Ligand binder design. Structure first.
Ligand code: ADP
Ligand code: ADP
Lengths: 50, 142, 521, 507
């Protein structure tokens, strides 16, 4: 929610999209404009780990 | 007749000193910004179109009693051309915004003696709990 | 003074224009109005709110007067004019404050309106029917609210188009008139909703309590009667001065012996069944059944009026009172072709085949909720209004908010190509035109900033590359926030209404801008 | 977005007044008077009628509750509580982003799901026997009333309900309000109440001279157009002198003479008259082989308009040959008691029987009146739909569980308002537990853990102890149409209060 509210769009639709795809655990909202509303990206092949 | 009419000061001071006999007159006041005045005016206009036997007067508060206080609410003055017997002072005797023609014709009881069996239940009160219970217990045991 | 009163008038006009702003289109909230008495009225109409509202400003008063004058002659389009005038005023306020003579911006607005009218008049549609009223699959689904049934809507659309295209009317001798509108309805309960039939000739009221007519032969022509004979008084026509106690018991036989010649003259040539309302006796029918003349009961005033206005057989030309000893003419004789009582929906109603002048279709509903009578009625009303408005006038425009963008682009291009003193006025007039799509997108709970941008980007391609003029005219949608082509399934609108609305808005803006001061001079 | 908040604030304020007045163990309110009076009562209707508010939403809710109480008669208290709870759980939590669009669709879907769940849980019943109906009536009427002569009263009410129905034609229309009244006469034993034809006649018939006795004639009533008028439509004759007055008597003779050759073929009797009584004209009228009565009030008018079917129109003479008066009707003026009583039996429009009770003072009158009223209301609410639902707090839990399961299975976007409106149905059990005097959290948790096993939807909370008991052993059942009407009214009120934009003034 804090990551989606500090970008430019809302956070309810992002949460609904993240909860509606699948329980894979490798999906997260991006940073570009083409990744705010869909928020369907695979961060495993990009290189974003913690 | 059967309809209200705007009155002035000369006609009022003439009707006061006229002193007739069996002529019924009902005068009312008027105030701006109060929906109760318009409601009672509509009620009187609807009632006057059924019993053409009593004169109605719709006076303005700025024409009578120039030095009026704050508690000078528009009331109803029923006169017998120089007789005083009913002075409905205070809107608490009615109910407020829940007023109808039956309550008006029951509170009047002087401009058309018909009595449509309204004296048996003019207004439904609030029945008590303890008083009614003890009354029923006294009546049943004796 | 000078500018302060003008700013106050502009602020008042902008404040009075924000009340009917959240009520444009079919999707809108309701508004409550109190008469300072105790009664509240809930309505969401653009005209009822403006009609029932108190005013105290001269500019607001003249604006309401102009709106009423426009609505007295134009059907719809009385809400967007106020918003257009408010936007024009709020855009010209900055121009006036930027040290510009109001005459210059007035002339610029006039030139922009003239150019817009000239560009609009060159973009119309010549054809009135496209593959049977927009393929008869798209012109009926958008004009019908489908909330409980929509799987078998194709059959309903086919029935509607067949009822509205087959029957026509012509009476002005100059243009085809609108077809039938007050068609007969029959609300049924507990029937097969997956099956419907269409028959010709409307039926009258159901005869209940007097169905003792052995109808076994095919008739031809019928008649009609407004009054009804009776031994005693009951309706109008009975005299009150003649006092005869020993004559009321034999007045029925005398009336029958008098009307025997009329009954024989009716039975001659070709007429049998007569139409008599309630108030007749049973002895006359039993006495006339031996010759071949009968009478159908259960006749109301609505059926009599429909019969008089359909076939044209009037009765007032000859009969007017209870005196049945009038002349025998063909005016009070219902010239028909075939009157039979077939077995439909387990009932026996009057079925008139091959009706002169008009030929209505019996629309019988199915067993469902009582709200079905208001489902197809609005669609039929919209269809007849469309076919009666676009017939004599071929000046229609597709879509609802797909023309303002092109108009603004053309006005901006004209202002850029002009290069005179009236350059910023045309630009402001073009900018003050995107207030309807934005409001429609806001009221639809969508993003207007992206929708208007996409619409402008799609409309700029049609003007940059001249390829066609009929296609590439997409607009907005009501179901979702996606651009849809308003041509294959859109609803056209009369262009004369929009032209008159724009002219009235421009005139109101000019009149308001021409007002200097309101001080008592 | 401040008008909706101010509206729901007043809605919750109004709803949080008669909240502790539900169930057998209810509290009592007290209202003071500005003059110096105090009245204690436990009826929410009196408090709602005596209150005076200034917000339009409160007045609209009061009018809706009054209409619901006048149309049905049972279930006009929980509607406001449910509406306030739904408002406080939906608008006061899901309006931070301002989106009043999908909430209406969510409410409609929730209402449809609740209707489907309540329809797919009902059980059939039979109306052949009479003991089961009497037992159901006695179980539903055991609220806050006396118990001494309730069986006979309920049996008489059931008989009157089963006898007053005659307007059947496919729609099943039942009218007992303006079709069956109540009569009272003191004197005699109190154990003789039954049903009779019922004629509103006390001291209206006046016969100064002694004539023949009425056995079984054929009375055909006419109209009321023989008063102090000027004629039919012209002012040719008037009542201004003493001589010309008796001239009207001659005309009165004609007023019957032509009738002797009109539709008068069964020889009627009394006629309705509003004005016209004397010591000389009445004698001639009685000698003219006809009788006339006077003194007609509103009750007699309603009786002749419902039972006989008398209309009001400007047509006294020359009517239909077979209008009214079809059948042998006896009219013997009995001397039972102390007043004149008429028993018009076997005439036009049957199945219009009234009650006959002989009590004592006014307390007996009031108690039998309220008993008949509540028994007839219960019988009408039961016979309207032969479907019973186990109440007490068992169907709401199952409905909420089904709604939660459907919301979890659909996996939609607007699931939050759906869950909020589904979890806002456990207000009645919580109020019952609070009124009983126990823990409202542990009992609710136990009920939720019990209403999720296998085949368990009739376990409610006892309204007298405070424990979970099965409804199959107690006997608490409710009708089906009342719950559906309550839910529909609550949904309509929520939709109306949620679609309020701005409020202005006008004329
Ligand atoms: N199906 C639709 N698609 C797009 N726009 C629509 C549709 N239906 C109605 N509208 C828009 O809704 C508006 C309704 O305006 P209306 O309330 O009739 O104005 P007025 O109140 O002045 O008559 C129209 O301007 C039209 O553009
Ligand atoms: N013996 C009982 N066991 C369980 N529940 C009961 C019992 N008696 C009454 N109740 C509950 O108390 C409630 C009383 O509601 P009531 O005050 O009559 O509503 P209203 O005021 O709308 O008529 C009923 O809904 C019923 O479920």
């Amino acid at each position: 929610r804090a990551l989606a509210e500090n970008s430019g769009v809302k956070a309810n639709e992002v949460i609904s999209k993240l909860y509606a795809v699948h329980q894979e655990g490798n999906k997260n909202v991006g940073l570009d404009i083409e990744a705010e509303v869909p928020a369907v990206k695979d961060m495993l092949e990009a290189g974003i780990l913690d | 007749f059967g309809e209200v009419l705007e009155i002035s000061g000369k006609d009022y001071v003439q009707e006061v000193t006229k002193a007739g006999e069996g002529l019924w007159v009902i005068l009312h006041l008027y105030k701006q910004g109060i929906p109760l005045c318009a409601l009672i005016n509509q009620h009187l206009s609807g009632l006057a179109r059924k019993f053409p036997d009593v004169k109605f007067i719709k006076a303005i508060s700025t024409t009578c009693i120039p030095n009026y206080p704050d508690r000078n609410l528009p009331t109803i003055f029923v006169y017998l051309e120089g007789d005083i017997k009913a002075q409905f002072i205070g809107p608490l005797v009615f109910g407020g915004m829940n007023l109808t023609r039956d309550e008006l014709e029951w509170k009047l009881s002087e401009s058309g003696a018909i009595m449509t069996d309204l004296e048996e239940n003019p207004k439904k009160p609030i029945e008590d709990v303890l008083l009614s219970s003890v009354r029923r217990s006294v009546l049943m045991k004796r | 003074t000078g500018e302060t009163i003008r700013s106050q008038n502009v602020m008042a006009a902008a404040s009075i224009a924000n009340i009917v702003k959240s009520s444009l289109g079919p999707v809108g909230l309701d508004k409550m109005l109190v008469d300072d008495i105790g009664d509240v009225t809930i309505t969401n109409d653009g005209a009822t709110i403006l009609k029932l509202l108190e005013v105290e400003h001269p500019a607001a008063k003249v604006l309401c007067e102009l709106a009423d004058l426009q609505d007295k002659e134009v059907g719809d389009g009385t809400t967007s004019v106020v918003i257009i005038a408010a936007e024009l005023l709020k855009n010209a306020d900055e121009l006036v404050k930027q040290k510009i003579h109001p005459t210059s911006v007035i002339s610029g607005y006039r030139l922009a309106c003239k150019e817009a009218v000239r560009y609009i008049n060159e973009n119309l549609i010549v054809n009135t029917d496209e593959l049977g009223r927009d393929c008869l699959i798209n012109a009926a689904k958008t004009s019908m609210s489908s909330k409980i049934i929509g799987i078998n809507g194709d059959f309903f659309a086919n029935m509607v188009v067949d009822a509205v295209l087959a029957i026509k009317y012509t009476d002005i001798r100059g243009q085809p008139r609108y077809p039938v509108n007050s068609v007969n309805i029959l609300k049924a309960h507990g029937r097969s909703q997956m099956e419907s039939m269409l028959i010709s000739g409307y039926a009258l009221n159901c005869v209940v309590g007097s169905q003792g007519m052995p109808k076994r032969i095919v008739n031809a022509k019928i008649a009609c009667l407004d009054f009804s004979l009776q031994k005693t008084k009951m309706k109008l026509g009975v005299q009150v001065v003649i006092t005869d106690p020993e004559k009321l018991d034999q007045i029925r036989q005398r009336e029958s012996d008098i009307t025997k010649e009329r009954i024989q003259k009716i039975l001659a040539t070709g007429a049998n069944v007569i139409l008599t309302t309630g108030g007749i006796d049973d002895m006359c029918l039993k006495y006339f059944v031996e010759a071949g003349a009968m009478a159908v009961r259960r006749v109301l005033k609505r059926d009599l009026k429909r019969i008089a206005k359909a076939s044209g057989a009037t009765i007032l030309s000859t009969l007017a009172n209870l005196e049945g000893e009038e002349t025998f003419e063909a005016a009070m004789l219902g010239q028909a072709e075939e009157v039979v009582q077939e077995r439909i929906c387990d009932d026996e109603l009057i079925l008139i085949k091959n009706t002169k002048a008009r030929t209505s279709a019996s629309i019988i509903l199915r067993g469902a909720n009582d709200f079905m009578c208001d489902e197809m009625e609005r669609s039929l009303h919209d269809a007849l209004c469309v076919v009666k408005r676009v017939l004599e006038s071929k000046s229609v425009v597709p879509g609802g908010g797909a023309v303002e963008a092109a108009l603004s682009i053309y006005l901006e291009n004209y202002a850029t190509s002009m290069g005179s003193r009236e350059q910023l006025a045309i630009a402001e007039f073009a900018r003050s035109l995107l207030v309807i799509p934005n409001t429609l997108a806001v009221n639809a709970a969508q993003d207007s900033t992206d929708l208007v941008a996409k619409l402008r980007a799609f409309h700029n391609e049609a003007q940059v590359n001249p390829e066609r003029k009929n296609l590439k005219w997409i607009g907005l949608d009501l179901s979702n926030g996606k651009p849809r082509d308003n041509k294959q399934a859109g609803v056209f609108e009369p262009t004369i209404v929009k032209v008159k609305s724009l002219k009235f808005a421009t005139e109101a803006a000019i009149t308001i801008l021409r007002i200097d001061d309101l001080i008592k001079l | 977005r401040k008008v909706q908040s101010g509206n729901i604030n007043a809605a919750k304020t109004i709803a949080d007044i008669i909240r502790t007045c539900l169930g057998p163990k209810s509290m009592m309110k007290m209202l003071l008077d500005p003059m110096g009076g105090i009245v204690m009562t436990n009826d929410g209707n009196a408090i709602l009628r005596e209150i005076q508010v200034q917000h339009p939403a409160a007045k609209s809710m009061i009018e809706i509750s009054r209409t619901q109480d006048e149309e049905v008669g049972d279930g006009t208290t929980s509607v406001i509580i449910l509406a306030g709870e739904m408002l406080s759980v939906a608008e006061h939590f899901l309006e931070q982003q301002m989106h009043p669009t999908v909430v209406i669709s969510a409410y409609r879907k929730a209402l449809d799901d609740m209707i489907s769940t309540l329809k797919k849980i009902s059980i059939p019943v039979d109306i052949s026997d009479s003991d089961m109906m009497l037992n159901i009536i006695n179980s539903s009427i055991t609220t806050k009333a006396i118990s001494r002569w309730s069986s006979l009263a309920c049996n008489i009410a059931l008989d009157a309900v089963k006898m007053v129905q005659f307007e059947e034609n496919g729609r099943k229309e039942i009218d007992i309000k303006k079709y069956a009244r109540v009569e009272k006469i003191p004197g005699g034993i109190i154990e003789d109440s039954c049903v009779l034809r019922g004629v509103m006649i006390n001291k209206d018939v006046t016969h100064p001279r002694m004539r023949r006795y009425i056995k079984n004639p054929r009375i055909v009533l006419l109209d009321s157009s023989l008063e102090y008028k000027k004629g039919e439509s012209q002012t040719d004759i008037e009542i201004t002198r003493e001589e010309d007055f008796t001239r009207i008597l001659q005309m009165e003779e004609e007023y019957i003479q032509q009738l002797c050759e009109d539709i008068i073929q069964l020889k009627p009797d009394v006629v309705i008259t509003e004005k016209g009584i004397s010591d000389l004209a009445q004698h001639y009228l009685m000698r003219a082989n006809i009788t006339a009565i006077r003194r007609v009030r509103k009750t007699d008018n309603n009786r002749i308009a419902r039972a006989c079917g008398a209309r009001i129109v400007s047509r006294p003479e020359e009517l239909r040959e077979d209008d009214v008066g079809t059948g042998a009707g006896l009219l013997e003026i009995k001397k039972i008691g102390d007043e004149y009583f008429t028993f018009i039996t076997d005439c036009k429009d049957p199945k219009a029987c009234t009650i006959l009770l002989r009590g004592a003072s006014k307390e007996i009158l009031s108690e039998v009146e309220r008993n008949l009223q509540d028994a007839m209301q219960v019988c009408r609410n039961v016979l309207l739909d032969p479907q019973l639902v186990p109440g007490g707090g068992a169907s709401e839990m199952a409905v909420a569980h089904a709604l939660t399961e459907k919301s979890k299975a659909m996996t939609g976007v607007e699931q939050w308002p759906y869950r909020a409106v589904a979890q806002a149905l456990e207000v009645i059990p919580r109020t019952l537990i609070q009124n009983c005097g126990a823990s409202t959290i542990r009992l609710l948790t136990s009920l939720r853990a019990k209403h999720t096993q296998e085949n368990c939807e009739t376990w409610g909370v006892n309204g007298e102890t405070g424990t979970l008991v099965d409804m199959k052993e107690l006997g608490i059942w409710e009708p089906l149409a009342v719950k559906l009407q309550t839910y529909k009214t609550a949904v309509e009120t929520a939709v109306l209060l949620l679609r309020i934009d701005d409020i202005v003034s006008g004329h």
